[PDB]
């Protein structure tokens, strides 16, 4: 359950050019992450509400679980695409440490 | 990212009869959880390995993400079914506190 994005930002320094050329992509990702997180929080609330009314694996509960999964999946994908687009801006020599952090975090289940 | 099952076990005391009549279900769920967790760890490793070879949203990476999602989803469902089967063994008077803990944890995204 680690925060893959935060892990990478904290663990892998960028050089001056790298920081500058990725600023716009970081801003766009922050906005996209917030939008999807709003959907995920709402979906979690709908699952909670469904179960509050009848705790059972019912059609309502099943559909609410799918909405949670879709929002979490959209966030996971958007996060990976952003990780990959950052990698493209890195100098080639700087990719091995970025990759190490990425791969290790994925292996532990971070998203 | 809270552990829904652990939250419920720690926060909601059971009476003597409740504890006794749920022991077999707890054992079965522990075994099922471990089996699915083994699959999830393996799937996380395969996603890490795929990205190690080419960090890109490629067919291999996409398929590995789906395997992670399927294992996580199987675990989420098995966990909820077990939560519901425990609820059935509770005395009716004991369900409101169980439900409170369940609903609050779901609202925060625990699974
Ligand atoms: Ni970033
Ligand atoms: Ni249990």
Curated annotation (Swiss-Prot), chains A, B:
Coiled coil: 17-80
Main localization (coarse): periplasm
Subcellular compartments: Periplasm
Residue spans, topological domain Periplasmic: 1-111
Keyword field: Cobalt, Coiled coil, Nickel, Periplasm, Plasmid, Signal
GO cellular-component term (any): periplasmic space
Highest taxon listed in the record's lineage: Bacteria
Induction: By nickel and cobalt.
Function: CnrH alone is able to activate cnr expression, while both CnrY and CrnR (CnrX) are needed for nickel induction of CnrH. Has been suggested to bind nickel.
Protein family per UniProt: To A.xylosoxydans NccX.
Name by which UniProt lists this protein: Nickel and cobalt resistance protein CnrR
Species name: Cupriavidus metallidurans (strain ATCC 43123 / DSM 2839 / NBRC 102507 / CH34)
Taxonomic classification: Bacteria, Pseudomonadati, Pseudomonadota, Betaproteobacteria, Burkholderiales
From-to range in the entire protein, with total length: 38 to 148 of 148
């Amino acid at each position: 359950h680690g925060d893959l994005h935060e892990i990478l930002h904290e663990a892998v320094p960028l050089d001056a050019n790298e920081r500058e050329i990725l600023e716009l992509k970081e801003d766009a990702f922050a906005q996209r992450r917030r939008e999807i997180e709003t959907r995920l929080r709402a979906a979690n609330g709908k699952l909670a509400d469904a179960i509050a009314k009848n705790p059972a694996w019912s059609p309502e509960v099943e559909a609410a679980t799918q909405e949670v999964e879709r929002a979490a999946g959209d966030l996971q994908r958007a996060t990976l695409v952003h990780v990959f687009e950052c990698r493209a801006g890195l100098k080639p020599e700087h990719r091995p440490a970025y990759d190490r952090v990425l791969i290790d975090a994925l292996r532990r289940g971070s998203q």
